[PDB]
Amino acid sequence: PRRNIVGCRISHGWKEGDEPITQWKGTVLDQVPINPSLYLVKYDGIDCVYGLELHRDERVLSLKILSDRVASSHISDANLANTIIGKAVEHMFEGEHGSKDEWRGMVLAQAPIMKAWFYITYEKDPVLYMYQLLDDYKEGDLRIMPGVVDGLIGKHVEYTKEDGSKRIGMVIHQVEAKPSVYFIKFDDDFHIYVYDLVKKSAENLYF
Amino acid sequence: PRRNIVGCRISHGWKEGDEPITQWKGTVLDQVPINPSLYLVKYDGIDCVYGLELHRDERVLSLKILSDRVASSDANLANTIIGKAVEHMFEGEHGSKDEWRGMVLAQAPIMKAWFYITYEKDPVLYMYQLLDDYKEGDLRIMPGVVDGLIGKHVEYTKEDGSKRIGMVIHQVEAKPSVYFIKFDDDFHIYVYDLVKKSAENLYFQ
Amino acid sequence: ARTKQTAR
Amino acid sequence: ARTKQTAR
Numbered sequence A: 001p002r003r004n005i006v007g008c009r010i011s012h013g014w015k016e017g018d019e020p021i022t023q024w025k026g027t028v029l030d031q032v033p034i035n036p037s038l039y040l041v042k043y044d045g046i047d048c049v050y051g052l053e054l055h056r057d058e059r060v061l062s063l064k065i066l067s068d069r070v071a072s073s074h075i076s077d078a079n080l081a082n083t084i085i086g087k088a089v090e091h092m093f094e095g096e097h098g099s100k101d102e103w104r105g106m107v108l109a110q111a112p113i114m115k116a117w118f119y120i121t122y123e124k125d126p127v128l129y130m131y132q133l134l135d136d137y138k139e140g141d142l143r144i145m146p147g148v149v150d151g152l153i154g155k156h157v158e159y160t161k162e163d164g165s166k167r168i169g170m171v172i173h174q175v176e177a178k179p180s181v182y183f184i185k186f187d188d189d190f191h192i193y194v195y196d197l198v199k200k201s202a203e204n205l206y207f
Numbered sequence B: 001p002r003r004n005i006v007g008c009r010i011s012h013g014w015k016e017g018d019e020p021i022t023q024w025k026g027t028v029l030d031q032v033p034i035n036p037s038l039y040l041v042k043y044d045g046i047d048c049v050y051g052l053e054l055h056r057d058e059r060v061l062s063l064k065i066l067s068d069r070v071a072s073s074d075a076n077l078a079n080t081i082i083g084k085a086v087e088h089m090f091e092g093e094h095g096s097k098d099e100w101r102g103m104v105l106a107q108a109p110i111m112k113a114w115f116y117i118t119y120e121k122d123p124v125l126y127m128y129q130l131l132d133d134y135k136e137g138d139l140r141i142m143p144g145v146v147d148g149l150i151g152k153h154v155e156y157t158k159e160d161g162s163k164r165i166g167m168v169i170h171q172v173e174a175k176p177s178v179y180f181i182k183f184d185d186d187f188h189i190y191v192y193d194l195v196k197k198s199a200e201n202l203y204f205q
Numbered sequence C, D: 001a002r003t004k005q006t007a008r
Helices: A078-084 A133-138 B075-081 B130-136
Strands: A009-014 A022-031 A039-043 A050-052 A060-065 A088-094 A100-110 A118-122 A125-131 A142-144 A156-160 A166-174 A181-186 A192-196 B009-014 B022-031 B039-043 B050-052 B060-067 B085-091 B097-107 B115-119 B122-128 B139-141 B153-157 B163-171 B178-183 B190-193
Touching: A078 A133, A078 A142, A078 B075, A088 A118, A088 A133, A100 A192, A118 A133, A125 A133, A133 A142, B075 B130, B075 B139, B085 B115, B097 B190, B115 B130, B122 B130, B130 B139
Parallel strands: none
Antiparallel strands: A009 A022, A009 A060, A022 A039, A039 A050, A088 A100, A088 A142, A100 A118, A118 A125, A125 A192, A156 A166, A166 A181, A181 A192, B009 B022, B009 B060, B022 B039, B039 B050, B085 B097, B085 B139, B097 B115, B115 B122, B122 B190, B153 B163, B163 B178, B178 B190
């Protein structure tokens, strides 16, 4: 057997290519039921969710369970959370050259474990991010804007590259609040990709 | 599939043994990811959740979709009972108390005003609109996680001596030591808290 | 309050 | 508002 790490704080070194070798800290959100070697992790200070085979990936150095802080959190106002979950939004970020940019996105769910945080993805950056979005909302930085397939979990998928060959992956989750939206893990990357099968931006997905 | 059924209303005949065929109607709650032949169903007027392989099970006759899936409620109140030990009041003879100790597990899928709940003396999966019980005073709130368990085969030794065989199909988010097990010989969803002594007889493979 | 159900 | 992170 092995110890559970879901819901735990973790730390490990990270050695990739010739990149500087660093020590990472984060929180394990999820052990993917359909592929239990795969864990979803929220790393401290890093916005995008990571999907890593934490016990198999050679880049992971000496995985440790931490006890530095409570891992979990909960939502202040669940009713308020329910008004943004499942909604298309404009999510404001600071612009590169001043002002703020409206990033079009979709609030997907409250995250597991870190329940004060929300899963969100973006039209221009369709991977999985996590923020404490009720903070954005209170500050005026989150504005609400005024293809379901059964049995997809675990299905292999390929995506057409501009280079011409196929990007290979697996469907790992279906979003409850918007069941035409799925999470995909591709073999070549740690991001969790989010696709809405009702959208033309998904026509490129082959099952 | 040509037509989805998760989240849909369905009807089908039920033919078990040599009883007269009866008609059942319900709502399909979930298709189990780790075993997508298995569906969880809430039947009209029936408290316990059914786990049925709706396409494979020979007892399921003339399965029909009555209506397709549609779009989706004090969530703050819901969150105060989810994951809590409770005393759930039912009525016995002539309105007498029939109080059951249990655990509120989750809001149900699809039927969001409904809650998953199980009981210490009857550890199978039930569904009720528990905020109604709560508001009426009939739900009192009271004062072991395993890596990679979903999909594992499970057995225990029955009194008869033989093995009862099933599979772990779900983990409860609000209480992650709590799992759903489907046994081959029955339609109930069994709910086990692996922290409890009542779970120590389970063997996983 | 509700009443516990028997099998059908 | 938040600052967008560089890719690491």
